[PDB]
Paper text:
Microbes use a diverse set of metal-specific sensors known as metalloregulatory proteins to respond to changes in metal concentration in the immediate environment. Zinc uptake regulator (Zur) is a homolog of one of the first metalloregulatory proteins identified, namely the ferric uptake regulator protein (Fur). Each EcZur monomer includes two domains: an N-terminal DNA-binding domain and a C-terminal dimerization domain. The DNA-binding domain (α2–α4) contains a helix-turn-helix (HTH) motif and is connected to the C-terminal domain (α5/β5) using a characteristic winged-helix motif.
The structure of E. coli Zur (EcZur) protein in complex with a 31 bp duplex derived from the znuABC operator (PznuABC) was determined by X-ray crystallography using multiwavelength anomalous dispersion (MAD) data collected at both high energy and the zinc absorption edge and refined to 2.50 Å. Analysis of the complex reveals the HTH motif interacts with the major and minor grooves of the DNA. Figure 1 shows the final model which includes amino acid residues 5–152 of four protein monomer chains (designated chains A, B, C, D), eight zinc ions, and two 31 bp strands of DNA (designated chains Y and Z) in the asymmetric unit. The three dimensional model of the complex shows the central portion of the operator DNA surrounded by four Zur monomers forming a dimer of dimers. The nature of the dimer of dimers ((Zur2)2) structure indicated that there were two possible orientations for the DNA to adopt in the crystal. Using DNA brominated at asymmetric points indicated that the crystal has an equal mixture of both DNA orientations. Given the pseudo-palindromic nature of the DNA sequence none of the protein-DNA contact sites were affected by this lack of directionality; however, several bases represent an average over the two conformations. Anomalous difference data collected at the Zn edge reveal two distinct Zn2+ binding sites in each of the four Zur monomers: the Zn2+ in site A is bound to four sulfur atoms from Cys103, Cys106, Cys143, and Cys146 and the Zn2+ in site B is bound by residues His77, Cys88, His96, and Glu111. Two salt bridges between adjacent dimers were observed, between Asp49 from monomer A to Arg52 of monomer B, and vice versa. Whereas the overall shape of the crystallized DNA is not greatly distorted from ideal B-form behavior (the bend of the znuABC DNA is ∼15°), two of the largest major groove widths occur at bases 15 (18.3 Å) and 16 (16.8 Å), significantly larger than 11.4 Å for B-form DNA. The Zur-DNA complex provides the first structural evidence that the previously identified closed conformations of the Fur proteins correspond to the conformation capable of binding DNA, and further reveals the molecular basis of protein-DNA recognition in the unusually long operator sequence.
Author numbering:
A (entry chain A): 4 to 152
B (entry chain D): 2 to 152
C (entry chain B): 3 to 152
D (entry chain C): 5 to 152
Write the structure that this text describes.
DNA sequence: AGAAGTGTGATATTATAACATTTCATGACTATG
DNA sequence: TAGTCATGAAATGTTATAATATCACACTTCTCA
C-alpha cells in the first residue's frame, strides 16, 4: 500500500505539472516501486511483459527516460541499472547512492560536504562541474549480518 | 612535480615483477596506448588503436588486458561513461580518487580526496552499511573548454 | 524422416560442405522457420526463440537471420518486413518470385528465370550492374478467394 | 521544371475530385526538388523548415495520399519514397533500379515481368493486386568509379 | 599434470537509431433534405 | 445535424542496429611436480 500511496503521489505530481503519467509509465513505476531497489532495464522489461506482452526495449527505455526526466527514478551508473528516488517532488538534486552488491538495495542520502569538497576542488583547479556522480558499493546492514553468520 | 607517464610504465613493469604477475607484451602495449591518451578511452577505440600493431586483435584481448590492468590498479574504469583511464597515482599505496571529466573535450583528471572517503564512511557508518569502494565522478568543463566559451 | 529433420540434415550437410558453423542457436532458429506456414517477423520469431532460449534478445535473432540469409536458407520479404524459408536449398543463389496473401499472410515462392533474364537485359541496356532482384506480388491466395467468394 | 509538375499535379487533382492541400503540395514540392529517393523522416526534417510543427503522421498521411494517386512510389527494399517518372501515363507498375553505393534510383518499365507474374498467379488461384519489382546493384557511374 | 595466456568465433548485455501507426481531441468541408 | 475529411499533438508500436562486454573452445606456453 506504500506502493499505492507512492503511485497516487506520483499521479498528483504529474497532475500538478502539465505532464502525462500513462498506464505504461505508471506500470513501470509500480514494478520498480515493488522492487527492493536496483534493476536492469531488461529484467524490468521481462517484468513489464507480464502485463504488456508486446513490450520491447524502446518501451521500457522510454518509460525510464520519462521517469528520469521527472524526479521519480535515478540511474545507477556503476551497474547499468535503475532505482526509485526516495523523495519525489524535489528538483534536480545530487544524492549519494549506497548500493548493496549482494541484494541490490540502494540507500539514497545527502552529502553536501562531498559536493562542497568537489566544488572547491573544481575551483582550485579550473573545473566547472555541472553534476556529481556519487555511488558507493558495499553491503547493507542485513546483508552484513548475513555475511558474518 | 608529478610522476611522468613513462615513469609510471617502468614502475608498472617493476611492480608486476615484484608481485610475480605477468606484464605481457599485449598488456604492456595496451597500457602504453592508454598512457598516450589525453584522458579516458573506450574499449573498442583502444581495440582500434591496438589493431595498427596487432590487426589480429579482437575484443577479448583488450578486455582481458583491461581486467588485468584494473586488477593490478594501473587503470580505472569510468562508470558514468563506459571508458577506461590510466591511473596517475599508483606509485603510492592504493588510493581513493575522484575523476573530473570534461563532457566536450573528454579529458579527465584523477584527484585524490580523503575528505570524501571520510564523509562517505561517516554516512555509511550511521546506517549499517559496510562500505567497500567509492565511485566519484564529476562532469562539467575543464579550464580549456571554459576559455573557449568566453569568446 | 520427417520433412523438418530431413531439412535440418540437408542444412547441416551444406554447412559442412561449406566450412561454416551451424550452431545450436542457428539450428533452432532454422527449425522454427521451417515449422512456420509461411512468413514471420523477426520479433515473433524472437518470441518463439525465447521458448527455448529465454535470454534471447533482438541481436540474437538478427544474427541468426543474417547467417541464414548469407547461407541462402531464408529469404527476406522486403514489402512486409518478414522472413521465409527457401523452398530449395539445393539451388545456388536464385531469383525467386514471392506471392503474398494480404489476408492470410501466407507466402508462396516460385522460380522465374525469364524474369532474371528480362531484368538482366533491361539493366544491361543501361550501364547497371545487377546483383539481386526483389520480386514480390501482393493479393489473395486461392483459399482466401474461395472464402471471400462467400 | 518543378513548378511544371506541381501545376500538372493540381490539373490532374482537378479531374480527380481530391483535395491537394499546401501540406501535400509542399511534400510533393520537396519530393520533386529531391533528385532521388528520400526517407520519410528526412522528408519530415525538410518539411519542418517550412512547417516546424510537422510530425511523422503529417508526412505519412501526405505520402499515403501522394501514393494513392500515383505521384510517388514507395521503394520497399529501402523503406524510402521516390517521385514518379511521369504521371501522365495510366496507373503503371514501376521496376526500380537501385544503386547500393550512391542511392540513385532509376524507374523503368518491365511489362514482361508483370506478364510473367500474372501468368504465374493465374496458374495458381492467386488474385494479383499489385507487383513489387526492385533491383539492387551499381549504376553505370559507380561502375566506372570502381573500374579505377 | 597443471595453472595461466592467447586466438578465434560466437554469443550475451545495454541502449538507441530508424521506420510507421495509434489515439483522441479539434476544426473544416459537405450530403442530404 | 451529422458525415467524412483533414490537422495537431503526444504517445506508442514496430523493425533493426549500435555500443559494450563475456563465453566457450582449442591450442599453447611456460611452470610444477
Ligand atoms: Zn533522488
Ligand atoms: Zn543487501
Ligand atoms: Zn588512480
Ligand atoms: Zn575540456
Ligand atoms: Zn528460395
Ligand atoms: Zn490467403
Ligand atoms: Zn512511376
Ligand atoms: Zn551509383
Amino acid at each position: 500500500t506504500t506502493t499505492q500511496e507512492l503511485l497516487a503521489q506520483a499521479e498528483k505530481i504529474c497532475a500538478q505539472r502539465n505532464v502525462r503519467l500513462t498506464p505504461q509509465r505508471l506500470e513501470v513505476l509500480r514494478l520498480m516501486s515493488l522492487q527492493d531497489g536496483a534493476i536492469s532495464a531488461y529484467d524490468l522489461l521481462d517484468l513489464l511483459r507480464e502485463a504488456e506482452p508486446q513490450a520491447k526495449p524502446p518501451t521500457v527505455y522510454r518509460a525510464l527516460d520519462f521517469l528520469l526526466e521527472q524526479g521519480f527514478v535515478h540511474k545507477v551508473e556503476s551497474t547499468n541499472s535503475y532505482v526509485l528516488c526516495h523523495l519525489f517532488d524535489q528538483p534536480t538534486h545530487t544524492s549519494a547512492m549506497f548500493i548493496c552488491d549482494r541484494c541490490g538495495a540502494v540507500k539514497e542520502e545527502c552529502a553536501e560536504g562531498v559536493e562542497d569538497i568537489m566544488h572547491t576542488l573544481a575551483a582550485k583547479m579550473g573545473f566547472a562541474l555541472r553534476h556529481n556522480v556519487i555511488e558507493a558499493h558495499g553491503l547493507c546492514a542485513a546483508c552484513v549480518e548475513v555475511e558474518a553468520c
